[PDB]
């Protein structure tokens, strides 16, 4: 017994307190951070990312994350890539009916179903058909750390 001290060997629910729907961008960043134990609240993330209440852009999000030492990259991946090496909590850009733009946190994509954590919703799982309809493109992939595998 005690072969390996698995850090966070259990899945938990990150209870992020929502304020406004524009906070969604900061709430996403918060969700991933707190998921790995990093105490970064969407409130503090809002002032960190320079959250614009008319257009919270991914440009500010990624830079502020990296200011925390939390490495992030803004990449473009297609639906086919979702079935490749997608195993990240990630801030993806979705636009509903070309009207309302929000960020959703991707957890994993399996059986053509994309498991997302929408800051405005609970835990919703969209099929490729549903997801690609609103998801134009744009994923801010987040690194849980640099050499965080070590201890």
């Amino acid at each position: 017994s005690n072969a390996m001290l698995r850090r966070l060997f259990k899945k938990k629910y990150v209870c992020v307190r929502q304020y406004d729907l524009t906070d969604a961008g900061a709430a996403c960043l918060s969700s991933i951070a707190q998921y790995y134990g990093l105490k970064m609240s969407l409130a503090k993330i809002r002032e960190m990312t320079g959250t614009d209440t008319q257009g919270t852009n991914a440009y500010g999000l990624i830079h502020a994350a990296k200011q925390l030492g939390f490495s992030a990259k803004g990449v473009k991946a297609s639906k086919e890539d979702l079935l490749k090496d997608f195993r990240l909590p990630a801030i993806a850009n979705v636009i509903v009916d070309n009207r309302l733009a929000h960020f959703v946190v991707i957890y994993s994509i399996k059986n053509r179903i994309i498991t997302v954590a929408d800051p405005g919703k609970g835990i919703v799982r969209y099929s490729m058909d549903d997801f690609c309809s609103i998801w134009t493109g744009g994923l801010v992939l987040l690194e849980p750390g640099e050499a965080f595998q070590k201890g």
């Binding site: 961008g25 852009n57 990449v75 991946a77 733009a101 960020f103």
Partner: peptide, 24 residues
Amino acid sequence: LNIGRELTDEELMEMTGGSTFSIQ
């Protein structure tokens, strides 16, 4: 994770999570 390289800033400026499109 390394999926690829990051794109131009304009792509990130285009990406938004609290914005509204089709302004009309």
